[PDB]
Amino acid sequence: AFAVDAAKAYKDYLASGGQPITNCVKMLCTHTGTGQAITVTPEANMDQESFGGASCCLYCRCHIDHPNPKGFCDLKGKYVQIPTTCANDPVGFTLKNTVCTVCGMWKGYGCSCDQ
Amino acid sequence: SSQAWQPGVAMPNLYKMQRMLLEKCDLQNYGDSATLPKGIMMNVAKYTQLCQYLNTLTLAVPYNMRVIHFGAGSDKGVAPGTAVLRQWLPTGTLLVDSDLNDFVSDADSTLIGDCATVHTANKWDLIISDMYDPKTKNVTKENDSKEGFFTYICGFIQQKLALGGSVAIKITEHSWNADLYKLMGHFAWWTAFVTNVNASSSEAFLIGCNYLGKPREQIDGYVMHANYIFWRNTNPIQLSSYSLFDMSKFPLKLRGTAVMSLKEGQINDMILSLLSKGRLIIRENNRVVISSDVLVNNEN
Ligand SMILES: C[S@@+](CC[C@H](N)C(=O)[O-])C[C@H]1O[C@@H](n2cnc3c(N)ncnc32)[C@H](O)[C@@H]1O
Ligand SMILES: Cn1c(=O)c2c(ncn2CCCl)n(C)c1=O
Ligand SMILES: [Zn+2]
Ligand SMILES: [Zn+2]
């Protein structure tokens, strides 16, 4: 029943003061995009930065299997929008948060479907 | 000059027509660096300006476009140039990248190994190469035409670049190949492009625009590299990040360029004219299949 739990390790590592994973690939863009979480092209709004998706995936960056039973990656080959206040740690951000299946925004960082 | 507000500078045509002897490259602005926007890597900026410049040329942009990117990995294990290329290229463009060492990529497929191990069944609409060995920056020995991966690239272009396709191949003062310059004369137009963010370096991208599959002009590659160095040696380029701040017109326009399968006997002057104007791609539209050779050893 053993499997490495990489998401837990990174969370505990961060909590004990570890420096976030660096070299996530930040894109140049207009910052007038839709602000949706994961997109086929950079979509940062004024309050976001856009990053190459694979460089923000914990599993891609660590050379480990994805928890998708098919091993498919949500981020690779796409662009992830990260709130500028959290752009010091895109990998930690994408791991800890979830995209709204209705409107495509980050829950609590753009999604207003609960009003 | 208004060159600071452009993505970079292309080699002026009059420098292409000279017969200079090869000299040492001595850049006035050597060792300076451009001020990059907050948190932007040099390679994101460099590829962004390269793509901004390619937006001004007559690139063919078919449906189901096929782009291959050599030397795509960085010291950091990621692929910044690939991410910019994917942003620039129309959505759905098949993007393959490759490098000698392992890296994490947004490309649709990634081949790890020496580029000479890379084989593809299909032809390509655009070849980008950032391959570079820094062990070539040896100022104490003569500066000869280099082989290595340049030999592969010349063969790859002649065998696997669709007619009408384009290339952008990174060179420096010491990292260059005479046959690659000769091959620029097999395109309808060519230049050497220096990005404004990296203008303090002898780096340029050697760009062949719309491949014709035959010599349109005869270029002596040794003389042309000397002409390139002469241009750099006498034209300081002011470092500039200005163009990085306007991305509104960045995406490559999906021109839907026609693709046709034609045999050599069918490429007449009218076809060659369409190829030259960025209005035609000649290749099959089959499935894209790649592989890398693997040497097998048992060290026991
Ligand atoms: C200037 S770095 C490219 C960095 C990358 N393009 C980026 O966006 O940051 C040059 C790359 O060319 C690669 N290279 C040099 N010789 C090669 C060869 N013979 N086959 C494949 N790759 C090679 C190196 O491994 C190195 O990563
Ligand atoms: C290694 N290298 C240099 O030392 C240099 C230079 N431009 C001026 N210098 C100073 C010595 Cl002339 N370039 C382009 C270069 O590649
Ligand atoms: Zn991943
Ligand atoms: Zn929502």
Side-chain angles (χ1 to χ4, degrees), chain A residues 23 26 28 54 60 76-77 79, chain B residues 38 83 86-87 104-106:
Chain A
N23 292 309
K26 186 157 92 164
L28 292 157
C60 285
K76 176 186 180 79
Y79 296 89
Chain B
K38 179 166 110 58
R86 195 169 185 83
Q87 168 188 17
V104 156
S105 175
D106 292 293

Side-chain angles (χ1 to χ4, degrees), chain B residues 34-272:
Chain B
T35 293
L36 295 183
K38 179 166 110 58
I40 297 287
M41 310 162 170
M42 168 64 58
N43 284 131
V44 170
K46 180 193 295 190
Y47 274 73
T48 297
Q49 282 185 330
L50 170 63
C51 293
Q52 298 177 314
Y53 178 70
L54 293 174
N55 282 344
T56 71
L57 307 183
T58 55
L59 305 188
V61 193
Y63 293 109
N64 289 316
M65 182 172 185
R66 315 153 157 199
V67 180
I68 183 153
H69 180 204
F70 290 98
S74 67
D75 306 14
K76 347 147 169 280
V78 291
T82 289
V84 175
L85 291 177
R86 195 169 185 83
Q87 168 188 17
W88 175 61
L89 297 164
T91 303
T93 295
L94 303 171
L95 183 55
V96 170
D97 64 5
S98 193
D99 214 323
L100 177 63
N101 307 296
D102 231 316
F103 66 104
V104 156
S105 175
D106 292 293
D108 298 298
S109 289
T110 297
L111 294 179
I112 302 311
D114 183 73
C115 65
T117 67
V118 169
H119 301 276
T120 70
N122 59 274
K123 299 213 183 195
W124 300 85
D125 305 316
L126 184 62
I127 301 164
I128 306 295
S129 167
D130 199 29
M131 290 190 288
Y132 179 67
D133 186 356
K135 299 322 170 74
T136 58
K137 182 70 82 62
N138 186 342
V139 300
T140 66
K141 286 149 182 169
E142 189 179 343
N143 179 16
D144 279 2
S145 176
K146 303 301 192 294
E147 289 166 328
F149 63 73
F150 284 117
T151 299
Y152 175 82
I153 284 288
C154 292
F156 192 89
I157 289 174
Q158 296 179 93
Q159 290 152 17
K160 296 292 164 172
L161 184 67
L163 297 192
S166 299
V167 310
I169 312 293
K170 183 249 218 62
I171 59 156
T172 68
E173 175 192 8
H174 290 93
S175 186
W176 67 283
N177 172 275
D179 263 332
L180 178 61
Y181 276 106
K182 191 168 188 249
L183 204 48
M184 300 295 103
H186 295 218
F187 298 75
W189 188 84
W190 78 278
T191 192
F193 176 75
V194 178
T195 69
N196 267 345
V197 290
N198 202 22
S200 56
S201 149
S202 62
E203 171 184 277
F205 289 87
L206 195 54
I207 297 167
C209 189
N210 311 126
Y211 182 51
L212 301 178
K214 68 181 193 173
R216 193 191 51 90
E217 66 176 299
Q218 221 56 72
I219 287 172
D220 182 321
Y222 301 90
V223 181
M224 194 61 76
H225 191 59
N227 288 345
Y228 165 71
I229 296 309
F230 176 71
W231 167 53
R232 302 302 315 276
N233 274 350
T234 57
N235 290 267
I237 296 162
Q238 175 189 337
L239 288 157
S240 179
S241 57
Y242 291 180
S243 74
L244 299 183
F245 286 89
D246 184 14
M247 295 293 290
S248 60
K249 311 282 187 286
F250 183 69
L252 181 55
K253 66 176 316 304
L254 181 41
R255 301 171 161 115
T257 316
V259 172
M260 291 194 318
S261 185
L262 285 181
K263 345 294 130 190
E264 252 306 320
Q266 301 182 290
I267 303 167
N268 58 43
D269 293 316
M270 185 258 298
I271 299 296
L272 289 163

